[PDB]
Amino acid sequence: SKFSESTLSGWTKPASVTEEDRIENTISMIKSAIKNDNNFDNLVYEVFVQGSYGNNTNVRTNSDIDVNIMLTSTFYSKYPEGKTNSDYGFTDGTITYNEYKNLILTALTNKFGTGNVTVGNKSIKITSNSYRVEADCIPSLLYRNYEYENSSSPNNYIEGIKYFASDNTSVVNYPKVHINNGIEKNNQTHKNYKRLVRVIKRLRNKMTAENHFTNENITSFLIECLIWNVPNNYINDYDTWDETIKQTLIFIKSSINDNSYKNWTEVSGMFYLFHNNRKWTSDDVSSFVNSLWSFMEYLEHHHHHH
Ligand SMILES: O=c1ccn([C@@H]2O[C@H](COP(=O)(O)OP(=O)(O)OP(=O)(O)O)[C@@H](O)[C@H]2O)c(=O)[nH]1
Ligand SMILES: [Mg+2]
C-alpha cells in the first residue's frame, strides 16, 4: 500500500483516554442519579457501557460514550412458538417502557439539569460540564430470548436489550453478547482483531476527509461487524498490517461476490449483518471496499507515480 507499517500501526492504536477514569466516573455519576431517586427503589437495573467504548473499538477520544440503563425487574421476552408470558409465570409488566423512560428522564434531570439533557430518537444525550459527563444514555428493558436455544426454563435465555425509539419503533440489540464475542475473537487473534477494526475505521475517516470516498451508510458498527467476520487466519497468518488489510479487502470482496455474505451475522450472532432493513446495502460495502483498495493503492500506480 501507500502507507508505511509505522503509519498503519499508529492507526491501530486505542484512542487515548485523556481522563483515566472517564468510563468509571461516567458510570458512577449515572448510577448515582438513579440510586438516589426514590422512584427506582423497588426496581432492579444495570448501568453498563456498550458501543465502541464497551468494545474498546473507539478511535476518537472526543466521541460520546454509550451507556445503557437496562431495567431487569421488568423485561421483554421472545418465546418459542405458541408460548406466552403465563407459560413462564410472568405478567405483562408492572411498568411500561414509556413510564420507565420518564422516570429515567426525571432522575437524569435532577442530577444534570434540564438544559443538559436532550432526548434524541434512540438515546438521551447528557452534556454535563459540572460532573464531566458527555454520554449518550439508552434506557432499555432487558430482552429475554428463549426462542434462540428453545428454552422452556425461565432462567435460561439469551440476554439482549429492547427499547422504543422516540418515533416508537422497536429496537432489539444484544450488546453484552456482542462484547463477549468480540473479546473472544480478540483473544484468538493475539489482540489484532480490534486493532484491525480501529485502522479500518480510521481509513474510512481519512477517505472521507481527503475527498476520496464518502458513504454515510458505512457505520462504525458495520465496520466492526465486517472485520469480526474476517476468518482468524487472515489476521494471524501475516506479519504486517499492510498485508493484513490487503487480505481483508480481498476476502470481503470475494464474500460479497460469492453471496456468502448473506450468512454473516453481526458480532452478537443474533441478527444477520446484511438485510433489507439495514441502513447499508451489499452495494454500499462493495463500494467501500473497492474505494479502500484504490485509496491504499494495493494496485501500485504506474511507475509509483500517482
Ligand atoms: O446494535 C446495534 C447498535 C448500533 N447500531 C447502529 O450503529 C450506529 C451507532 O450506534 P452505536 O453508537 O451503539 O455504535 P458504536 O458506538 O460502535 O459506533 P459509533 O458511536 O462510533 O458510531 C447507530 O446509528 C445504529 O444505526 C445497530 O444497528 N445495531
Ligand atoms: Mg457509539
Q: Which of 164, 174, 166 is nearest to 96 (CA)?
A: 164
Whole-angstrom distance, CA of residue 33 vs CA of residue 30: 5
Whole-angstrom distance, CA of residue 212 vs CA of residue 295: 7
Tell which one of 122, 217, 219, 281 to mutate to probe ligand 1, the residue whose CB is within 8 A of the most ligand atoms: 219
**Closest residue to atom 11 of ligand 1, CA basis:** 51
C-alpha cell of residue 116: 443538559
Tell which one of 26, 221, 225, 273 to mutate to probe ligand 1, the residue whose CB is within 8 A of the most ligand atoms: 221
Q: Quickly list DSSP for the chain.
A: --S-HHHHHHTTSPPP-TTSSHHHHHHHHHHHHHHT-GGGTT--EEEEEEHHHHHT----TTSPEEEEEEEEEEEEEE--TT--GGGGT--S-SS-HHHHHHHHHHHHHHHH-GGGEEE-SS-EEEEETTTTEEEEEEEEEEEEE-TTTT--STT--EEEEEEE-TT--EEEE-HHHHHHHHHHHHHHTTTHHHHHHHHHHHHHHHHHHTTS---TT--HHHHHHHHHTS-THHHHS-S-HHHHHHHHHHHHHHHHHTSGGGGPBPTTSSSBSS-TTSSS-HHHHHHHHHHHHHHHTSSPPGGG--
Ligand 1, CB cutoff 6 Å, lining residues: 50-52, 63, 66, 173, 219-221, 224, 279
| Residue partners of 201: CB distance under 8 A and separation at least 6 | 57, 59, 220, 223, 224
**Closest residue to atom 25 of ligand 1, CA basis:** 221
Query: From ligand 2's centre to the CA of 238, what distance in Å?
Result: 30
CB of 128 closer than 8 Å to CB of 113? yes
Return the CATH superfamily for domain 22-178.
Answer: Beta Polymerase, domain 2 (3.30.460.10)
Would you tell me how many other CB atoms lie within 10 Å of the CB of residue 291?
Answer: 18
Resolution in A: 1.6
CB of 251 closer than 8 Å to CB of 257? no
| Residue partners of 131: CB distance under 8 A and separation at least 6 | 25, 29, 111, 112
Would you tell me how many other CB atoms lie within 10 Å of the CB of residue 19?
Answer: 12
Place of cell 485509496: 295
| Residue partners of 194: CB distance under 8 A and separation at least 6 | 14, 55, 56, 57, 182, 186
Burial class (CB in 10 A: 0-12, 13-18, 19+), 121: exposed
**Closest residue to atom 7 of ligand 1, CA basis:** 221
CB of 72 closer than 8 Å to CB of 45? yes
Query: From ligand 1's centre to the CA of 81, what distance in Å?
Result: 30
Q: How far is CA 19 from each of CA 14, 57, 62, 136, rounded to the nearest angstrom?
A: 14, 17, 11, 18
| Residue type, position 89, single letter | G
**Closest residue to atom 14 of ligand 1, CA basis:** 51
Phi, psi of 149 (to 5 degrees): -110, 10
**Closest residue to atom 27 of ligand 1, CA basis:** 221
CB of 185 closer than 8 Å to CB of 173? no
Whole-angstrom distance, CA of residue 177 vs CA of residue 182: 8
Place of cell 439469551: 158
Q: Which ligand is nearest to the CA of 140?
A: 1
Phi, psi of 142 (to 5 degrees): -55, 145
Query: From ligand 2's centre to the CA of 37, what distance in Å?
Result: 27
Query: From ligand 2's centre to the CA of 135, what distance in Å?
Result: 9
| Residue partners of 72: CB distance under 8 A and separation at least 6 | 44, 45, 46, 141, 142
Place of cell 428463549: 146
Would you tell me how many other CB atoms lie within 10 Å of the CB of residue 113?
Answer: 15
Whole-angstrom distance, CA of residue 210 vs CA of residue 275: 30
Query: From ligand 1's centre to the CA of 52, what distance in Å?
Result: 8
Place of cell 481527503: 210
| Residue type, position 15, single letter | A
Place of cell 455519576: 29
Task: Please give the number of the atom of ligand 1 that sits closest to the Cα of 57.
Answer: 17
Query: From ligand 1's centre to the CA of 219, what distance in Å?
Result: 7
Query: From ligand 1's centre to the CA of 99, what distance in Å?
Result: 25
Q: How do beta strands 117-119 and 124-128 pair?
A: antiparallel
Greatest extent of the chain over all pairs of C-alpha atoms, in Å: 73
State the structure-solving technique: X-ray
Whole-angstrom distance, CA of residue 267 vs CA of residue 178: 5
Whole-angstrom distance, CA of residue 32 vs CA of residue 84: 36
